[model samples]
Target: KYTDKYDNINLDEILANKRLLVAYVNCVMERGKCSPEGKELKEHLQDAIENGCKKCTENQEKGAYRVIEHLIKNEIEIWRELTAKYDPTGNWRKKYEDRAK
Candidate 1:
């Protein structure tokens, strides 16, 4: 019953794919932007990326995901929902408009 969805995920691969990372972050961040959730999540993620650099010097991808998971703990489901809906190969600008607005 215990499932680790990210157990096998390669953060390296996710980061290597520009569209993938963009869609994932964009969808996750935009949803928070248009809601009552405020910018705490965004700020946390930004700090994680900015500060995590030195911390995860050799494993930037892992560090980034670690930060994402930690900051979005209980809200992982929301993040998952948005990520699932994101079409990385499609017109993300349009999707971004629809989701952000």
Candidate 2:
């Protein structure tokens, strides 16, 4: 697991803030600089997915779900972009369909 430092971040604030959210997307997409937290997330994102989020702290896992659910529903553009970058094959979509709904 990555450090728990980012676990307490306010997800709702980021999710609703387009500029901040896009910064996060750009970080992962290699289009912009990453905040330290974004760097950590970028570093471990694929690892977390490959390992079925086994590396996540309990709250981290839960927070990931909330982010995913909202992105899938509300932030369609970035969610699609992220899905393409991280889960292009769509297996993860099927895997998390219920939770994302």
Candidate 3:
């Protein structure tokens, strides 16, 4: 029950909407204010990246994989931006990309 709170969110709605997606990106990148869920997501991003979201619910892990796959496939600029900020050396980025593939 640690992070079960976010298991039901519509990841597609946010991904389909550019403004909403950017808000999340900006939040994680510390570029601006955060939405409620965005704030929660930002707080856990480091752990998610490094630990592969060890505390995540099953659905949340699937959701994360979907979102990251989406970014890797479609929203590539955002994908690159996120990786640049989070895994500057491409260490984790390569791992993530391999997983996404």
Best by lDDT: 2
Candidate 3 lDDT by residue in tens digits, 3-95? 677668899898999898888988898998998888888887776677667778888878888898989988889899998887776767777
Residue 22 in model 3: shift from native, Å?
0.9
Residue 16, model 2, lDDT: 86
Query: Which has the better TM-score: candidate 1, or candidate 2?
Result: 2
Clashes of each: 0, 0, 0
Q: Which ten residues in a row have the lowest lDDT in candidate 1?
A: 32-41
Per residue, candidate 2 scores C-alpha lDDT tens digits across 26-53 of 9998889999999999998888878788
Runs in model 2 deviating more than 4 A are none
Q: Evaluated with TM-score, which candidate comes out highest?
A: 2
Pairwise TM-score winner, candidates 2 and 3: 2
Q: Model 2: what TM-score? A: 0.91
The sequence of per-residue lDDT tens digits that candidate 1 reaches over residues 4-87 is 333455665755566655555554557422222223334343443334334223444454455345324534554454444443
User: How much lDDT does candidate 1 score?
Assistant: 0.43
For each candidate in the order shown, give its overall lDDT on alpha carbons: 0.43, 0.85, 0.82
Error of 1 at 74 (Å): 28
Candidate 3 deviant stretches above 4 angstroms: 99-101
